[PDB]
Amino acid sequence: MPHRFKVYNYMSPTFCDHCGSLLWGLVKQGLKCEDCGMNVHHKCREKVANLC
Ligand SMILES: CCCCCCC(=O)OC[C@H](COP(=O)(O)OCC[N+](C)(C)C)OC(=O)CCCCCC
Ligand SMILES: C/C=C(/C)C(=O)O[C@H]1C(C)=C[C@]23C(=O)[C@@H](C=C(CO)[C@@H](O)[C@]12O)[C@H]1[C@@H](C[C@H]3C)C1(C)C
Ligand SMILES: [Zn+2]
Ligand SMILES: [Zn+2]
DSSP states (O other), X not given: OOOOEEEEOXXXXXXXXXXXXXXXXXXXXXXXXXXXXXXXXXTTGGGSOOOO
């Protein structure tokens, strides 16, 4: 199974589980997988390992 990512709004320091970098911004800072809770930058979504 693929991940199921959704635009998400974080309220605590969250790193991208793909690239290691912080998710920046006050809103919509990245995507969260509905099923496993992975956090990724919008542009990292297409590069992540897709076994959820
Ligand atoms: C200390 C108790 C648990 C920690 C919660 C920390 C917090 O302050 O923010 C609330 C959860 C925390 O993460 P979540 O509760 O969203 O869970 C992570 C992913 N999954 C839902 C799949 C498990 O998410 C955020 O970071 C921000 C969401 C709200 C954004 C509002 C602008
Ligand atoms: C654009 C301006 C800034 C200031 C940022 O990017 O600041 C980022 C930093 C370094 C800490 C912040 C966080 O923990 C936030 C979540 C993340 C997601 O990881 C950080 O992006 C956050 O917005 C929590 C605080 C904001 C802030 C303290 C909010 C949005 C409720
Ligand atoms: Zn997943
Ligand atoms: Zn990333």
